[PDB]
């Protein structure tokens, strides 16, 4: 008995450290704080992440996640990672409106709602004066910070929300620099939304400053994440359950109690896994 063509049909741990299981949510939903994932904000450290092949609750408001697969990878292998209130709703947007903004696109039970980890700044009365809040990475680790730019469909929409057509956003740090122009243009409804909204994200070195400047269209961060990278993992797309068990190899079909050289099961694998080819017998 010195080869392997079998899988346990489960998803076990790795270094006795269980997977992060996202349920019906995908990564974006999970990080942005999609309402339909509220049950997995408290996820504390893990080996490898598990999407399902039909995990459709993600970016409930339409538009692009920029460098999604880059952010996917960044989050896959992760040791000890922790959410905190980067720009508190209490004290950070004093002269912009901090609750007027929710949408029919992002609902938690028949009620207009919006992402947990972000907050959609709308104008306060007649003016959206420049904001310019900044965050210092006083945490001694990669702080992951995400935000949104909103792209309304009408020019009237703009006034309604952000007042100023001469609207921009800027994001800046010791590693990131971009000005965002709102591209305002009529579109086919998606989720009753002619408008769109793109989601971006950046990592901030410890010690480093990151600053948001905007005259409009900014979807500011509220909750960010202090994280420590790990390596030697990815994201696996399965339907088979998790169990309370140990292993040193994992695949979408199942786990591999392996000491031995190759496998016939699945090519994408996690950790101390044989190469894919076809390996069953040795007389």
């Amino acid at each position: 008995n010195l080869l392997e063509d079998k899988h346990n049909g489960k998803l076990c741990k790795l270094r006795g450290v269980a997977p992060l299981h996202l349920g019906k949510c995908n990564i974006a939903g999970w990080i942005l704080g999609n309402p339909e994932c509220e049950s997995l904000s408290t996820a504390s450290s893990w080996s490898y992440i598990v999407e399902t092949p039909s995990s459709d609750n993600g970016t409930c408001y339409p538009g692009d996640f920029i460098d999604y697969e880059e952010l996917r990878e960044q989050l896959s292998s992760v040791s000890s990672f922790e959410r905190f209130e980067i720009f508190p709703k209490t004290s950070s947007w004093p002269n912009h409106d901090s609750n007027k903004g929710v949408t029919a696109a992002c609902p938690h039970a028949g009620a207009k709602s919006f992402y947990k980890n972000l907050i959609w700044l709308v104008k306060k009365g007649n003016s959206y004066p420049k904001l310019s809040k900044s965050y210092i990475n006083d945490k001694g680790k990669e702080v992951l910070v995400l935000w949104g730019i909103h792209h309304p469909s009408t020019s009237a929409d703009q006034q309604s929300l952000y007042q100023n057509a001469d609207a921009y956003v800027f994001v800046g740090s010791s590693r990131y620099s971009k000005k965002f122009k709102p591209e305002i243009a009529i579109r086919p409804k998606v989720r009753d939304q002619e408008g769109r909204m793109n989601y971006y994200w950046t990592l901030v070195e410890p010690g480093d400053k990151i600053t948001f400047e905007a005259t409009g269209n900014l979807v500011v961060p509220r909750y960010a994440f202090a994280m420590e990278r790990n390596a030697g993992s990815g994201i696996i797309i399965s339907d088979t359950p998790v169990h309370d068990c140990n292993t040193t190899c994992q695949t979408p079909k199942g786990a591999i109690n392996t000491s031995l050289p190759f496998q016939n099961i699945h090519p994408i694998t996690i950790g101390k896994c044989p190469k894919y080819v076809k390996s069953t017998k040795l007389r």
Partner: antibody
Framework: EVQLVESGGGLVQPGGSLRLSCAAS????????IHWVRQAPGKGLEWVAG????????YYADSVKGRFTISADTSKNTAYLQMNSLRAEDTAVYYC?????????????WGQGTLVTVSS | DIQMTQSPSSLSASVGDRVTITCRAS??????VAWYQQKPGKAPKLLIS???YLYSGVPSRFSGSGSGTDFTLTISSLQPEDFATYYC?????????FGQGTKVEIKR
């Protein structure tokens, strides 16, 4: 019209005391914050004082610690640099400038300057 | 804290010409840099926000660049009005530091 008209500077006896106001036509005060940058002729600009009103906070440069103090009347649109124990290094053109990020911003508008002269 | 070394300390160049003014920060700031033109006597004026982005005046020839430790302000087609003095500011941290200035002289 954005405005930072600065008034009340002049000659004074060393080891002395002059208040120097920076008032604002057009816009409010608290949501912004004001910086005092002065300019001893020929050197180039040097930042000395800063205030965030809505926040309530103030911070100072090494070189004017404990002497100068920034206040600001919400009722009058104005901010004030109280300059104690003046010197010949403080003889200068003092500028107040408009500012937003208390973590560090740039200068949207400056006033025009006030001249402070302090020796013999 | 931080200091903003300029180069040259003053410059002669005829109209039409590419004036270049470089500025070396003492700490790795990042894009937290502004450029100021100040016509002597009067109060300074903002050219570039955030390292590159032309401020909304009428400054079309003035244009920022750089990153990290060194930033550069170019002037592509110089004028009789660009005689003034030019400073790089930082706002990475306090105390907020400027350079000494660069005095661009017009030849004619």
């Amino acid at each position: 019209e954005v405005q930072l008209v600065e008034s009340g500077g002049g000659l004074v006896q060393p080891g002395g005391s002059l208040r120097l106001s920076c008032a604002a036509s057009g816009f409010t005060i608290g949501d912004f914050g004001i910086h005092w940058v002065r300019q001893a002729p020929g050197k180039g600009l040097e930042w000395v004082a800063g205030i965030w009103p809505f926040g309530g906070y103030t911070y100072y440069a090494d070189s004017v610690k404990g002497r100068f103090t920034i206040s600001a009347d919400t009722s009058k649109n104005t901010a004030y640099l109280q300059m104690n124990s003046l010197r010949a290094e403080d003889t200068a053109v003092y500028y107040c400038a408009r500012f937003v990020n208390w973590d560090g911003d740039y200068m949207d508008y400056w006033g025009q300057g006030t001249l402070v002269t302090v020796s013999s | 804290d931080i200091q903003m070394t300029q180069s040259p300390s003053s410059l002669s160049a005829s109209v039409g010409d590419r004036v270049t003014i470089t500025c070396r920060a003492s700490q790795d700031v990042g894009f937290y840099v502004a450029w100021y033109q100040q016509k002597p006597g009067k109060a300074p004026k903002l050219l570039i926000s955030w390292s590159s982005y032309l401020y909304s005046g009428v400054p079309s020839r003035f244009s920022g660049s750089g990153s990290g430790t060194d930033f550069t302000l170019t002037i592509s087609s110089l004028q009789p009005e660009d005689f003034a003095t030019y400073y790089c500011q930082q706002y990475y941290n306090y105390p907020l530091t400027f350079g000494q200035g660069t005095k661009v002289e017009i030849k004619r």
